[PDB]
Amino acid sequence: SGLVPRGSHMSNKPSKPKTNMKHVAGAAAAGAVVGGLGGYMLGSVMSRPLIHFGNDYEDRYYRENMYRYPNQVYYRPVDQYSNQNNFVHDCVNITVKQHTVKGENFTETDIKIMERVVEQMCITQYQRESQAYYQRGAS
Structure with missing residues (x-):
């Protein structure tokens, strides 16, 4: 047998009285x-490369549309x-979505490299995300 009284859990302590009305930006x-x-x-900020083609055209094109x-x-x-x-x-x-945005459009050929x-x-970003993700300890 065993039907002891159980089922009592609660935790609430809203101690953040916000009575300010000054949110000027x-x-x-x-x-x-x-x-x-x-x-x-x-x-x-970044330094290392993000994409590595290997072909001349594919290379020049990238650096060419880099500013684009x-x-x-x-x-x-x-x-x-x-x-x-x-x-x-x-x-x-x-x-x-932001790349194909109406703000800017590219040729069917550009979409390939883009x-x-x-x-x-x-x-390539996963490498960085993991570097910081692995680190445990927020001092």
Whole structure:
């Protein structure tokens, strides 16, 4: 037998009284500036290569359109539940959205390489994400 009294758990302590009404953000307003992704990490600074073609044309083309398109990319933090694909999967899609955006368009031929630089940029990022992800200890 065993039907002892059990089933009592509670934890709540909202100690954050916010009675302030001063949320001024300086001065900046004109027309309208889009910006709604959700919360994806944005590359701050980098040095090493992101994509390696190997062919002359494929090489010159990349460095040629280098200024045409940005270098930053939206990616999420890795995890133990899944592999890099967890973030790399949407990493490419999201990038394609801002890449193929009406703001700028490229030829059918450019889309070929553009997809490579972006794709490789997603996986190549996993190396860094893991470097910081592995580190345990927030001092």
